[model samples]
Target chain A: DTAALLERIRSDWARLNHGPSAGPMLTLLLLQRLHAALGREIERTYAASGLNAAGWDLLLTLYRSAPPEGLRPTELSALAAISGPSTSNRIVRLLEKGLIERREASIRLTPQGRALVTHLLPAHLATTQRVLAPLSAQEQRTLEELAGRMLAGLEQ
Target chain B: DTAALLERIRSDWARLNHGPSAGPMLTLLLLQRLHAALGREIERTYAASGLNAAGWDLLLTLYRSAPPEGLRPTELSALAAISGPSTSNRIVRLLEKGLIERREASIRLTPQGRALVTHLLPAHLATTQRVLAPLSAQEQRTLEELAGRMLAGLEQ
Candidate 1:
């Protein structure tokens, strides 16, 4: 049913564009919508934990890096997929909230930050699970393999 | 190779977070990166055509709708995946460029706009093809099926 709806949109596009088949465009549209849906749901969970997505991303990256010496803003930016200035802004907010601290040119999660992320982990995973519950385990594995191939292809 | 890299990231996350397995999170990460890469490529094509992504989306939606009667701003916004104010802003920009015109309470493309979209269609499709070239036709079909399933699940 959903595929039919998307196929209808694709046909309408094909009628006007007179270009490639609707396959790639339809794939992109579906991916975009799926991304937006999952992102919003995760963001809501982050909000309930008193953090924005950026803030949660930053803390989690630092926590995972497990670097007692902390990481530079550039490193954090790369890992978190956040821009430099925006990462700096998030760091400032986290620092003010006592969730993270600066060590020379690097940053690390404070004890409070560590504790907060540890506490939020289960709920975050639960939220992710709930959102993906529609797919059976077999479907999830198939998706993972197909998505992995697409990711590799795109990276190339 | 891509799966390994993602697995490494997952391991890192698990080491620090002590949460659920990283399947869902890794899948989401790969999807996000794939989307970003494809989006940038498509946006570049649009930029070469003297339009940004949002502007192109607006014109293309109107063109596809084939509405001699035009479409309301709300309808256009929904179709273009743009917000109301943002759609209004794009309408103003397109109007200034003589690509689109307001007809009573609705909006539709001018002859110039339709021609512009027709001219740009091939390149847009070519770009989509290139970005998706890594996936085989069979893989592409599989991806569409899996992504369709995910989208339906997410929407639910």
Candidate 2:
């Protein structure tokens, strides 16, 4: 639906001489709609598990990257690619769900939390595979290449 | 910054035997960060112009493809490539701003609205150029091609 919407804009935009490089404008919009489609699938995967995307990201951090001793809120936000308020809210949810707990001024998974992540990890990975099922590995590699170039340009 | 964070996750995800295609995961996340960076430039451009992007989009539609008499809300959203609620909210803002008005239950730009659209179109085009300054025309073409492939796959 969004792709079609984007195409509508591009078609209309293409007819207008009010722009330079309509291709560039369309490219940006295309990827946004593309990312959004992938997000819906990604979100669905997490949501079906009664979890959210940001929450899963933070949980993954705790599972793979955190010290066994745990991490403080500041440290968690630093490690998580998500926002502070965003991460805080998810962690707060985890705390309420008893999936995580406060310990010595730091956060650690409760026993159930650890088990839940262990349970969810495979499905989560399966999620990466499912959402990306359409593209070949080679195509995926090229996408990375193209996107990296865009990132480098933006960063510069 | 997000690219770095995405890289951090990719590096971390690599160590875990968790995924079938980490490349795909990275590709998705990378473009999300890339698109977000591009959006900042875009948003900055629009913000500096004392207008909003979504609002500008609707105005562009009204100026280019809309009927002489005007369009209904349903008609506007159909042409605009934005969500109904999203488009409605922004149109609400435009109505408040007196850029557009209701006539016989259809939306038509006021005389002031038409003037404002004429004023903003050039800057909006300039925005496409500024945000895309980093990408070569050739790169932009390739980007469109790559993004089109992704869109096709998603739509399929």
- Which clashing pairs does model 1 show? none
Candidate 2 lDDT over residue span B1-156, tens digit each: 535566566666777774443676577667766755666666664576567657876776787666778988777766653443334588778889888888877888888888877876676667766666667777677667666666676664
Candidate 2's error at B132, in angstroms?
3.1
Error of 1 at A101 (Å): 2.4
Q: On a 0 to 100 scale, what is the lDDT of residue B25 in model 1?
A: 69
lDDT of each: 0.72, 0.69
Error of 2 at A93 (Å): 4.0
Poorest stretch of ten by lDDT in candidate 1 chain B: B79-88
Docking outcome class, model 1: medium
lDDT of 1 at A101: 88
